[PDB]
Amino acid sequence: FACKTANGTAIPIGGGSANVYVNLAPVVNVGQNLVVDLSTQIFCHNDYPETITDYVTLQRGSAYGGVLSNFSGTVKYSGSSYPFPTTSETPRVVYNSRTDKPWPVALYLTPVSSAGGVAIKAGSLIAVLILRQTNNYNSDDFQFVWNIYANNDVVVPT
Template sequence: MKMKWPWLTILLLQSMTASAYECASIDWQGGNADINVNISSDVSTGKNRIVDLAPQITCKNTAGQGGWIDTMWLANDGVKLNSSIFKNLKYGVTISGTDHLAPVSETKIFDLDNGESRQLPVVLYFELTSLGEEIHIKAGDNLGSIRFVQTNNHGDRRDYTWTFFAANDADINTSTCSVLSGSTFNVNLGQIERGDIVSGGTSSQTIVKDFNIICDAAHAVDFDVKMSLVSPSWNNKAIKTSNDNLGVEMLWNGQAVSNGASQRLSVTNGSATVPLSFTPVKPASLSFEDVSTGAFTASATLILTQY
């Protein structure tokens, strides 16, 4: 591109391979390229990243002198996703923090002066506008492509396409689920009679409350449900309260739940309901008179992990 040769035919042959512009980590020095990228399975409603090129690819103007400025562009309608994988989902590209929904018009990415290098600030994304579908990606799958244009201040212009392939397997579930009671599941045990407090199981003071979850997927959605709690020293299946001699046992479908215990929850036909029961309990060695009166509080956390 910058070298002078005595014969035009030799100059044309050299221009096929020589470049003063290259991108590290993919060993790119011009022309079309196949690039392996890591895929994340984490998704949410709205925009989701497929590929973030900035941490993976850095481009550099390798000209040593002469005032060369290289400019990188996204080509007109230059973003394509593999429709056999991503189906009818909307998609686009984010350039330096600005979103461009496909089809994208020609857009400048950056300028590079002599010797300057920059991470490639390009992110491929899709939008969850068609919920309930599953996306299965295998290592080696063709994800899509980006067409770039490289120009410089000496009038050169080059077009090339980077085709992206998955470097890992990724199963992406685009459904969304929500707990009907919200992020906080409040249980009011009401007025408790000390004489009726038991040391385990259920009692006349047991409160039953349904745990409801809904999903917008047509297929079954499976969860691992884990309880995170602090237990009193005298009962490892109870939730510790602000009253030292009072705890609360929670039963999931009739089974006592301890810290770290996992349950499987499958949401079919769009919803699932699990009865939870809450029972105030005391140490078996103590009489009810040893339980202090007054208000008390307790808390625990249910962790739902979709798989």
């Protein structure tokens, strides 16, 4: 089991960490959503589906910078929504194919009432999402840490 990002940066068997750069809507008003869909950014595959079943959860999701201070939101994982920052580990998603499959996680963020101006700075860390991978084969328990960075400023009209 290993993963790779849209631009090809990968985290090998055993886990590790990688940065994911995302382009964000430049203008987001209070009452509107800023959707950060990682399903088009992070992909993983099972290296031995003939024998092993891989289990993948969103172990933890944390907010940073402009997202931590100016937005409120939830994280959608494999069809279900949870609080973000996360309060617990999500249920497992099975990976049983050698073909790359998307990691079904998306952040649904919305400006807080007092949000205004540059709510998110270009190049800043907005979130850290931890993908935890285990299996039905051995004691492997690995973390694939995804550091989500904003490619541009996000402005909230005042």
